[PDB]
Amino acid sequence: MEMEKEFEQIDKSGSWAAIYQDIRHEASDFPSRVAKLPKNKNRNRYRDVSPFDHSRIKLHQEDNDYINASLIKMEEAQRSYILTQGPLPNTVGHFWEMVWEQKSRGVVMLNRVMEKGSLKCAQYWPQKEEKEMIFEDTNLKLTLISEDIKSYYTVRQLELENLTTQETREILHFHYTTWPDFGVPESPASFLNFLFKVRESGSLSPEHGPVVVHCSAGIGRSGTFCLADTCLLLMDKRKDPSSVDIKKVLLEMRKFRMGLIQTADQLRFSYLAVIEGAKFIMGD
Numbered sequence: 382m383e384m385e386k387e388f389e390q391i392d393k394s395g396s397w398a399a400i401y402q403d404i405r406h407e408a409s410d411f412p413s414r415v416a417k418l419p420k421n422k423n424r425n426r427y428r429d430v431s432p433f434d435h436s437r438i439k440l441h442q443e444d445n446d447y448i449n450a451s452l453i454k455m456e457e458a459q460r461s462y463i464l465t466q467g468p469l470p471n472t473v474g475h476f477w478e479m480v481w482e483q484k485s486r487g488v489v490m491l492n493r494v495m496e497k498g499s500l501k502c503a504q505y506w507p508q509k510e511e512k513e514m515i516f517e518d519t520n521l522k523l524t525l526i527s528e529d530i531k532s533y534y535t536v537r538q539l540e541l542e543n544l545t546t547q548e549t550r551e552i553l554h555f556h557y558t559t560w561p562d563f564g565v566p567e568s569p570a571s572f573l574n575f576l577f578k579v580r581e582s583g584s585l586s587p588e589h590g591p592v593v594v595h596c597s598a599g600i601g602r603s604g605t606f607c608l609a610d611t612c613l614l615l616m617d618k619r620k621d622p623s624s625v626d627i628k629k630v631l632l633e634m635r636k637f638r639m640g641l642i643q644t645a646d647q648l649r650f651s652y653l654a655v656i657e658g659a660k661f662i663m664g665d
């Protein structure tokens with residue numbers, strides 16, 4: 382079926398939970414043996430969220446190459462994304478090592494450091510220009526260059542230096558700051574505006590390594606971001622945009638990381654975002 386009318390048909394019939402459970406039943410199951418090794422317990426935020434072995438990002442290190450991060454490679458859309466958990470106190474150096482080694486331009490953050498009164502990720506970037514951060518375990522230096530605070534999101538320019546080679550690179554930090562502590566946003570308008578700002582920066586384009594996207598577990602809000610982006614790109618590429626099947630795209634993405642889209646409300650919100658976004662692209 383088309384999307385917008387399949388949407389109204391699920392709303393009127395109140396069957397979002399059944400649609401979402403079907404997706405959960407059909408989703409791929411691949412091994413994640415490296416994630417479960419005892420030496421990696423303090424590298425995982427949640428015991429039930431792990432990268433598959435076949436798609437995990439490897440650190441360029443001979444001691445321990447493990448990080449909780451997955452490469453989502455979308456062949457028809459010609460887009461790739463790295464989805465990862467919010468960094469832990471003992472993985473902030475690994476996080477920036479990955480950004481460096483994978484040649485990423487941008488980092489997309491969809492959570493606040495504290496939500497619901499608890500810590501959801503480490504404070505892994507510097508908050509003042511004159512107070513830079515040094516990660517001694519991976520030999521990297523990180524400096525805040527500029528910060529632009531807007532009503533729904535903040536964009537930061539960062540300098541990452543490989544202290545071993547003295548090479549430097551500019552990284553863009555795109556921080557969506559207004560996702561509610563409970564539920565999903567009422568309108569997708571600010572989320573779509575944010576997606577378009579990431580696109581306009583070059584951070585999603587083939588001349589760079591894959592964008593790094595995270596929330597707390599790296600599957601819920603993060604899944605919503607890449608699902609909406611890929612679906613909109615396919616609608617632009619194809620002769621028949623109504624042939625884009627958001628459930629089929631989501632199942633394709635779940636071949637590369639488990640659990641993407643965590644609730645039926647997140648699934649409904651993803652439909653809403655793609656529907657509204659397809660009107661703004663055109664032609665109007």
Ligand SMILES: CO[C@H]1CN(S(C)(=O)=O)[C@@H]2CC[C@@H](OC)[C@H]1C2
Binds near residue numbers: 645649
């Ligand atoms: C768990 O409640 C869900 C179920 N569905 S439903 C009745 O299947 O349409 C709706 C989708 C949005 C969601 O909000 C959480 C609610 C309402």
